[model samples]
Target: EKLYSPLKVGAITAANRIFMAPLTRLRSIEPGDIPTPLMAEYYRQRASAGLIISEATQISAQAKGYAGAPGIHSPEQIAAWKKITAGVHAENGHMAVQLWHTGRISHASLQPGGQAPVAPSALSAGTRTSLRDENGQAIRVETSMPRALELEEIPGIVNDFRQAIANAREAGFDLVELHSAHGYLLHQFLSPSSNHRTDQYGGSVENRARLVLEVVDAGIEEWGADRIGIRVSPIGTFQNTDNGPNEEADALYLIEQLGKRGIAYLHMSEPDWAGGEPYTDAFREKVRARFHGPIIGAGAYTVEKAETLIGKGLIDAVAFGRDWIANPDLVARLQRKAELNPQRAESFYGGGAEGYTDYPTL
Candidate 1:
């Protein structure tokens, strides 16, 4: 029953502790990357989640990495999202907009004027991203080499993030989550392996964390500390982005700074999803000590592990990603031990309602 208990996080009160983690469902309109009514129905079906963190949304056109992933920068996108939040709210559900800047994890085709994606340094992620072929099939392609961002351009990137969060409110979202995890633009800056800059935004770990802190403060300025949350992959070495030699120290420093600002909560993305070791209790305890706010754990989480961690006070909530995609009534299923619909890999990217919204619910 602990998982079913309501808890307050930031300015919002969740009806339960089960959250739908942000997922990159490539179902948005391609040309403009706008959210559609079909996408709204998909979210509306999963309104049973305590709080559904929407798919990683591009803060600006330049932030987009994958085709069919949505953007929140323009008018039609904002209007479309307004309807989506309305759908969730009408069902008495809460949602948080997860803002993302893909950084070096992007392709030239996705960037403006086919320019190289910007990063803290001109390094290749050595990873592949998704794009559509002439047959309208999503195909994997190598990431384009990135150009290190000019120092003068850093402030505009921060402003783009700030503007995105402000747009979240106008789009009718209850909260905003900075997608600083998963080797995205923010993560690229935080991870030393990709950030080879010797400027104010690099060098020391303190300098590396400068951009994220600036973005957080800007969000707090617009949405207040209570309305802002951040997701970070401290230990996960995703898309070739690693913390380098500093290991977890870089993350702890950033977490400590986040605590000082008192954001709503922290979403800890683990490496287990990538076949790496799960976090030890010692690490969990360290995180709890640093940030007193709500902590949501994701990445290969199990019901038993979630309950055990919650009982141990290491995590206040669990954000289930794949589980919720298959079980729209995941909360009810978990509560009653109901069978879950198996998630199909083919429909995982760009497809119709076949596997997207047609999942049966008890």
Candidate 2:
């Protein structure tokens, strides 16, 4: 019913209100951190979604914080992604690339020339990130203390996102989403626990949101606002990111500003898993009041709950993560009311075909 209804998301009309959220599978080809035919086949299998947001892809060599995630900065990577996007288009599916940088949640081993990871301030996320040891095996290691970015370096970071947006367009992406949520680089600038800069990019809510807004502006400059989207996590404390004293107010201000930009959509990552507060109706209403564009709610949403939210006009869409991994034909299963397959946690990251493209369809 409501879940299958067509919804307008900026320049394009999504086929249904069942968008597939970006999930990191870490199965990209090594050597160049490029995408492979296997990744293409995996995405092609799930093309039935209203829209597919790719896993968080690095924008530059310095943007990478993990060993197996793909990047969009190199020629080889761009060529590889072109095939993936072409495959999705061949199947009549819409796709968006989520541009990302991990900030302090990175180890020097994962950085260029083994330099310290950069952040808005010289703070440690105190979180463990995936990195390759000297022996070349992936291991979980504690993040290193990050070097605070100079005032001049901020513009360079923004330009990196701008170039990444241009690269995604060249690779044939229908839309591009900025990874501003989940304690990434942009999220680090937004949170007080991490950002202690006294410049125009920190301190107050407006200042703290300055860098993200700048990056969004860059995205809009490269691709029109209608082809861009952003993800946010207001109450999430993942990767040692705290909301500080004015979390809700700061998030509301940021949302309102983004809505004013007339962007395509806003994807809010609910913080249910990290023991964060629930995304209550009052909060939803506040978000609705600010952002008039399509809103996507994600995190532990069941089919019935998603349908109810859509029916009540609270959210325009729901993004399913693990469900999409296990059931490539998730929308079809939801439409037919068929049983779904369970995702194998062991096969989720850096694996072959076991939990990826081999999932059976009804």
Candidate 3:
């Protein structure tokens, strides 16, 4: 019953404790990076989730690094997202948009005017990103070397996030989530391996976490502090992010600061499956010691594991990713202890309704 219990998250109350993790399906409409009707139906089908965090959405043209991802900068994109949010609300589901900016994890072809991507430092991520070729075919290619951000330009980035949150609110989103994980723009600033600058934005834990806090403050300005949330992957090394020796201490410091700011929630992406350190009980205890608000743990979690964590009072909610894709009625299935459908990897991205809305339900 713990999983099905209603939980208060800021101004909104989630119907249950089983949250749906944000996923990148790349099904957004092209040319303008807008949400489509199919994407609306997809979320509507999975409305059983207590709270649904939308796929990573770009804050501006420069914030985008992927071809098919949605954006919140344009009028058309915001208008399209309104329909999607309306659909989810009609199903009695609360949703939040994950604002994202891919810093060095981008190709020149994906950048505006074929320019290099920007980051805290000029160091290349040494990772490849999916981009469209000259013929408009999707291809995996190495990310281009980035241009280091000047001191003056950092304010613009924070403003972009603030504007994105305003746009998400206009689109009827119940809340906004800042994507500071997965080696994206914000993550690029947090890690020592990626951010080697000697400036105030780098060096120590407080400096490394400065930009993220600034952006969070900007978001809180647009929407109140309690209406915002942040996602972090402390030990994750994905997308060429090297978690330095002090990653754990730095992450704990960041979480404590966020807790002091009175943010809505802290969503931690567990790194155990990503070849990083496991989310041990000691670490959980450390996190609980710092942040008294609701904590949401995400990774490859099973129903029993989720229940155990919830029962132990370590995490208030569990976020399901791939399982929510294949099982639209995941909460119902878990309640009945029914079998789940197998996910089709081929149709996971850039597809129509075949693998999206066609998922069967009990």
Candidate 4:
């Protein structure tokens, strides 16, 4: 099986084909958006994985939707991240930063000075954010109606990603993953359900994917193409994203477009997780046809399940999510078929090191 095969990926050599999926725990320390020392320790404990993709990190203040999630826009944030990366490297592990912008899902309270969350359109998410106010109840802030980009503002968004790449480097990340999934800004542009415009950034496949392509190019300029990866959810129905009738065609175009970039990897979430129809083997083959680089598949993957999929040549690697959260030594446990501790969903967000760092390792 390819799971046991060794493969070369850019400048880094992965010992195996397993990787850690990025999980947004919202455990960042307050005021500074800096990842706490405990956060660093949390990652340091999971260094056994072939690669660790840190949680979805805000690229700017306006991009922060979930309270307590870490950011990399400021020097203090970079410094804090540096410590985390350094600790991971000290343990002989490789880490990458997931660059994120929450778009319309973000609330004004999460933004600086209560500024509105920007998107391809100002449409409300019509859903509540995971962040809650002082009452411990889910916060239902109205999504600030979005202002459509004037074409002039598009470059600034791309520049934001370019600057984020620089920040990722400053934070000691070995690679950068463009967060183009889960109804984020980039995903909003790609999904017709979220984007409705007459500009070059909307409509047809080429227009819809313009933002992500530009962001990828900008990221490549900051970090080499070999050091840059992109994540996408073409059929993702989660977070109220709409999959138009042309989803398959759009997805094919998107993957083909990315193939031209020679990115380090392409990460995708399978369709089954969001209660959508399961992706058939033929569907997987169709996606494989579009990507020329290493492919990482994520979403509710268990050790045996991931191994089975990888063995079948479905993906180059598997990304473990909740398992990694509850068991810091997840890779070791998977390798040894050890027992896994259960994850506490209540403390998954806006928690200190309680559920964040208190997870036991075998």
Could you give the C-alpha RMSD of every candidate to the true structure, in order shown? 1.0, 1.4, 1.3, 2.0
Top model by lDDT, which number? 1
Residue range 74-132, candidate 3, lDDT tens digits: 99999989999999899999999999999898877778899899999998888877665
Best by TM-score: 1
After superposition, which runs of candidate 4 have C-alpha atoms over 4 Å from their true positions? 1-6, 132-142
Give the Å error, residue 33, model 1. 0.7
Better by TM-score, candidate 2 or 1: 1
Candidate 2 structure lDDT: 0.88
The per-candidate count of clashes, in order, stands at 0, 0, 0, 1
Error of 2 at 257 (Å): 0.2
TM for every model, in the order presented, reads 0.98, 0.97, 0.97, 0.94
Task: For candidate 4, write residues 136-249 as lDDT tens digits.
Answer: 434445566655656887788888889999989888998889899988899888888888878988888899998899888887777788888988888758777866777777
* Local accuracy by lDDT, each model: 0.90, 0.88, 0.88, 0.80
Structure candidate 2, residue pairs in collision: none
Model 3 clash number? 0
